[PDB]
Each structure stands twice: as structure tokens, then as C-alpha cells.
């Protein structure tokens, strides 16, 4: 069947070649870029103790949570540098973090395979864990809250799982990946999501149907972190192959290959600005790269850190970009 | 101050959060996290039983072993429920104090060689040094001295090797035990460059100095980490 299913996977590469009329770089040859823009660190968020594995923004655009691998989830007042909460975790190796759109909840997704959903807005002042989502048989590489009582979570098992915090059990288990799914990004319409994996394939998923809608290949290495383009019809994935790839939903191709030849380090984070014109990756050379997501130019470097940039996020209002790295510090850019 | 009243205590909470974090820093910086990378059929599952019982969930990926020896806390972190692809969960341990890569020297090992070769020349596990910690010597000498049917046809460089200068053991076992040591060091000192130095040992189920073999060779990393800050070493 391996030679029999190869032509059907070759049916995808020529159905995508049938739509391959003109590239995004050929389309956007007549649109003026953002140019070499200065972007400066506004708040250095000192206070962690270890490598900041992943941060996430509130949808309130101000509350920032970050996962550092010291056993500390810290919720930041990012506007005033204040630490809104610090959460002593049980899993000291937390790989990822997810702030709820409601803002009541936060997830640490440990290396220990629990998505400890912490309830921030308790009647108690303590941030107790509401549902340590045990399961998922692999390092919890990403998680993204859909609602207050529904989270989708990525695993080191080659399988993403949609959970229910009020129950405590994975309602859906998205099991299309052949390699460890390293990240996960929910759609703006929160009815799809995307998941980039160590199988070099980013798989589009339906959250309700549980089905692999499209599998986006084209990356040469393990897709380290992923984010949706904010109109929900595209996403850029960032692999270890140092080449970010903007794929298009309902098109099954890669549009822009954000490849600079002087960059060989892995793209360990990806975020999209509110326009989706300014895609700002978090590379492993201790700097970001605010790519023009249409012109595919470098268009801005965020060199604020000493160690590899593990996590970018642009706010829902698009105003800040927090940036955590493998030091104790989160730089907030503009 | 120009801060409001509920923002005056939003800092006074945040300062008391930092006061907890500067208390958690003393707990973090005075405790030495140790990755523990024994493979299948190795001795990892009993060394985390040995180091725990000497001194202090159904699919949990990390088992934390908190052992203190000479009154300094260590956290051995063997990696349980994660699958065989170590590519990405091993990056998370770039700021550990050591990597206790436990080896089945009894079995035949090239998988343990090619694992240690990848753990050494990894871009994130370079500048952190493996405590090589060769376990199961009671059955390693049984595979050479007592049994002798486990001869080294797997390893063609055994015929061109003899124990150079090394410490009641048989001379054919001590040649073998210091070849298993020498097989890793041919993949350790090749791409070490002084940033991280492998600290090998020999262990068993009845070792009982296994945690002291960590701490005395974990001192030898933090010493060598600080000597590299003085450009001394």
C-alpha cells in the first residue's frame, strides 16, 4: 500500500500544482513593503528563573502568561511590567502555555504529560489547578484554549487532543501525524486549528469533526512552532530548517518561503501581526525576524536576547509582541 | 507616585511575587537538575530507585527524583512516557547540571553509542556534560569473564585496543569495562571542545555510591563551568 498510497499523495502534489498559477512573491512584486522598521523592547519582563519555553497573550491584549521551565507560570501585567500571577507548577519542565480567551483560565503543558489548567479567577486567591488533563502520552508541546471549558492540546505523541476541562477527558484525539506534533495554533474562527509536527507536515484539523482537513508539507525539517494568519485562511509554520513557510488554507500549498541564506538556526517561534503583513518569527540565533509576510523580506530584527527565542505572540489588538527566550527575560516589542 | 491605588498594590503584589520568585530562585539555583537518559534494557529504572532510596501518573512523561548528597539538592529527571524521538524534549534540558546517560554495557550498545553521539553533538546539549555512569557491571563482567560468548565481534576496534592506564577484577573484564568507557570517549572528546566534559563511572544494582558518583562528578562540572568563566579551564 506504501507504493499504492504514494500516487494518491502524488495526486495532492499535482492537484496543488494545478492551482500553482503564480507565487505570492510573484504576486506581491508590486506592493510596497513595511521596509526596515525599527522595533524596540518596551518592557523587559525580568523575574523568571529558567528558559521561557512558551508565552501566550490574553485576548484582552495586556495580560501575558509565560511558561518558563523552572516550574513557574507567570502571568504578566505586560503594560506595567507587573507580575499578575506566578504559578508554582508540579511539572517543572513546562513546554508550553495557553491563556484562555475568557481570561479565567491558563494551561501549562508540561513535559510531564498533563495539561494543568489553572483557574486564575477562583473565589480563592490561590491559582489552583482546575483540571490537570492527564493523558496524551507524549510531551505536551502546545495547547490553545478554545473556550473556558474546552482546550485543544498538542503532544509529543504524534497526536493532538481536544479536551474538556469540566470533564477532564480528551473529547477528540487528532491522530493524523506521523511525527511528534511540536505546536498548535487555533483559528480566529475557533472551528479549525493547525498543528505543525516533527514529521515536517503541518496538518489542518477540524475541531468538531476531528478530521485532518489538509496536510501541509513543504518544510524540510521538524516544524517547531506555528501560527494562523489572522484572516483564518492561511498560516505560517516555522521549522528547524530555518525557512518559514506561509501555507494557505483551502489551497494546500506554501505561498511564501521566508528563507534568508545567512540564517541556519531553527525557527523556534512564529507569530502573526494583526494585519498579517508582519510575520514575526522567533529564531534560535537569539533574535527574531519580523518578516514582511507578503514581500518575504527580512524587514526587521528583534535582537533583544542572549539565548534562543522560544516564543513570540502578537496581541489580539496587535499592539505588543512579547518575546521569551531561554533566559529569564521577556522582551515586549512594538 | 503616578500609579493608581489599585496599581500601587498591583506592584506591591508584583514585588511580593518577585519576593516569592527570589525565594524560588534560591530553591532553583541551589538545586541541580540532572537529565537521566538510560535507554531500554539499561539500568535507569533502578538508579532512580537507588539514588532515591539512598537519600531524599499513569502516563507522566517526567519522574522527578529529589536526592540530596552532602546536603545539596539534585533533581534526577528520567524521561518516562515520551516516545523514542528524543529530538525535541531533550532541548528542554539545556540548563540541567548533568546528563546521566545510563548505559547497558552488558547488551550490545551501538544504539547507546549513537544516542550519546547525538546527545553530545546536539546544539542545545553541548555545553552540558554527560555523567556517563556505565551501569550493570555485574552482568558486564558476566558477559566477558564468566560467559565469554558475548565477545566483541560487534566492535572491530576491540582487537586494536588494550587498557592504557586504569584501575579483584579480571584483566579481560577490566579491558572490556574500560573499552565501553573508551567507546563513548571516542565520541565524547571528538566534539567536546572543552565546553562540556564527560564524567564516566561504573555502576550496578548494588553500587550504593551512585549518588556520590554523581555529586563528585557534578561538582566537577560546576567547577569546570566556573573555571570556564575565569577562562581558567
Amino acid at each position, epitope marked *: 500500500l506504501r507504493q499504492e498510497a504514494e500516487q494518491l499523495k502524488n495526486q495532492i502534489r499535482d492537484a496543488r500544482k494545478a492551482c500553482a498559477d503564480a507565487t505570492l512573491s510573484q504576486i506581491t512584486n508590486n506592493i510596497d513593503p513595511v521596509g526596515r522598521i525599527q522595533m524596540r523592547t518596551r518592557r523587559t519582563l525580568r523575574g523568571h528563573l529558567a528558559k521561557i519555553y512558551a508565552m501566550h497573550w490574553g485576548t484582552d491584549s495586556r495580560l501575558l502568561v509565560s511558561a518558563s521551565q523552572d516550574g513557574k507560570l507567570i502571568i504578566w501585567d505586560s503594560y506595567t511590567t507587573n507580575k499578575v500571577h506566578a504559578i508554582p507548577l508540579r511539572s517543572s519542565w513546562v513546554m508550553t502555555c495557553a491563556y484562555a480567551p475568557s481570561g479565567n483560565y491558563v494551561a501549562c503543558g508540561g513535559l510531564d504529560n498533563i495539561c494543568s489548567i489553572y483557574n486564575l479567577k477562583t473565589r480563592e486567591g490561590n491559582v489552583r489547578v482546575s483540571r490537570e488533563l492527564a493523558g496524551h502520552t507524549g510531551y505536551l508541546s502546545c495547547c490553545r484554549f478554545l473556550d473556558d471549558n474546552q482546550i485543544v492540546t498538542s503532544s509529543g505523541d504524534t497526536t493532538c487532543a481536544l479536551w474538556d476541562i469540566e470533564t477532564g477527558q480528551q473529547t477528540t484525539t487528532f491522530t493524523g501525524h506521523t511525527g511528534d506534533v511540536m505546536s498548535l495554533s487555533l483559528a480566529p474562527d475557533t472551528r479549525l486549528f493547525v498543528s505543525g509536527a516533527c514529521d515536517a507536515s503541518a496538518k489542518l484539523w477540524d475541531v468538531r469533526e476531528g478530521m485532518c482537513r489538509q496536510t501541509f508539507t513543504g518544510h524540510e525539517s521538524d516544524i517547531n512552532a506555528i501560527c494562523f494568519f489572522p484572516n483564518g485562511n492561511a498560516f505560517a509554520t516555522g521549522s528547524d530548517d530555518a525557512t518559514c513557510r506561509l501555507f494557505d488554507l483551502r489551497a494546500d500549498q506554501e505561498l511564501m518561503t521566508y528563507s534568508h541564506d545567512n540564517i541556519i538556526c531553527g525557527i523556534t517561534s512564529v507569530s502573526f501581526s494583526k494585519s498579517g503583513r508582519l510575520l514575526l518569527a522567533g529564531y534560535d540565533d537569539f533574535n527574531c525576524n519580523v518578516w514582511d509576510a507578503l514581500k518575504a523580506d527580512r524587514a526587521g530584527v528583534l535582537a533583544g536576547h542572549d539565548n534562543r527565542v522560544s516564543c513570540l505572540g502578537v496581541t489580539d489588538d496587535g499592539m505588543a509582541v512579547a518575546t521569551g527566550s531561554w533566559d529569564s527575560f521577556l522582551k515586549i516589542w512594538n | 507616585c503616578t500609579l493608581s491605588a489599585e496599581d500601587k498594590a498591583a506592584v506591591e503584589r508584583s514585588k511580593m511575587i518577585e519576593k516569592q520568585l527570589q525565594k524560588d530562585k534560591q530553591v532553583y539555583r541551589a538545586t541541580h537538575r540532572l537529565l537521566l537518559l538510560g535507554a531500554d534494557n539499561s539500568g535507569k529504572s533502578t538508579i532512580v530507585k537507588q539514588m532515591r532510596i539512598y537519600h531524599v501518573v499513569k502516563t507522566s512523561g517526567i519522574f522527578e527524583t529529589k536526592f540530596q548528597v552532602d546536603k545539596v539538592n539534585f533533581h534526577m529527571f528520567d524521561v518516562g512516557a515520551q516516545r523514542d*524521538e528524543r*529530538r525535541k524534549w531533550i532541548q528542554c534540558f539545556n540548563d540541567v547540571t548533568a546528563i546521566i546517560f545510563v548505559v547497558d554495557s552488558s547488551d550490545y550498545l551501538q544504539e547507546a553509542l*549513537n544516542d550519546f553521539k547525538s546527545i553530545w553533538n*546536539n546544539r542545545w546539549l553541548r555545553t552540558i556534560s554527560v555523567i556517563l555512569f556505565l551501569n550493570k557491571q555485574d552482568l558486564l563482567a558476566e558477559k566477558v569473564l564468566a560467559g565469554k560468548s558475548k565477545i566483541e565481534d560487534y566492535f*572491530p576496534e576491540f582487537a586494536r585496543y588494550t587498557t592504557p592506564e586504569d584501575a579483584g577484577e579480571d584483566p579481560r573484564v577490566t579491558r572490556a569495562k574500560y573499552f565501553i568507557r573508551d567507546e563513548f570517549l571516542r565520541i565524547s572528546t571528538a566534539s567536546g571542545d572543552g565546553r562540556h566534559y564527560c564524567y564516566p563511572h561504573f555502576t550496578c544494582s548494588v553500587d550504593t555510591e551512585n549518588a556520590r558518583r554523581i555529586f563528585n562528578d557534578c561538582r566537577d562540572i560546576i567547577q569546570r563551568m566556573h573555571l570556564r568563566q575565569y577562562e581558567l579551564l
Partner: nanobody
Amino acid sequence: QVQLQESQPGGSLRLSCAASGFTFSNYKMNWVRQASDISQSGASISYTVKGRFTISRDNAKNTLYLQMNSLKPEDTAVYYCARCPAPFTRDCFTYAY
């Protein structure tokens, strides 16, 4: 995708891995068996058996070569052209990808 298509003792049976869908120039594409690596553009080759089979490489032809000449009966197994996916880095890490 990352397409790696592989192609009585003592017979010189050499098999040609076909590396398509990626660069294969800055990828230290090793070999694994189912009963030994390379570097970028060759010139740093390691083995397990250390002289029986040799690992060539052709990045210009976009392919990996393995020349098994003096193979044992134990060497007759399923062969897989592995790929160390972290580029320009010797980080070669149920073995499925």
C-alpha cells in the same frame, strides 16, 4: 514532504537512497537497519561492520549511497535511509520519521 526512497552473503549489494522534497546538502543523512552516518558534503563518516559497508553521498545528484560489499547474513534486513533533521548540526535523533 521529506521523501527518502531506498533502492548469498558477501555479495556487493549497494542501495541508493533517493532524498527528495528537501535540501539534503546540510542534512547529515544516516542509515538505520531493522534486524552509521554521514556529514554535510561527506568528509565526516561514522559507522557501527565498520569496513563491510561504506556510506557515500551525492548532494549534487540529491541522493544518499550505501555500498554494502561484504555483508553478513545478519545484515540481510530492512534498510531505512534516515535523515538527521536539525540542519548543520550533528543532532541525529518506533523510529518513524
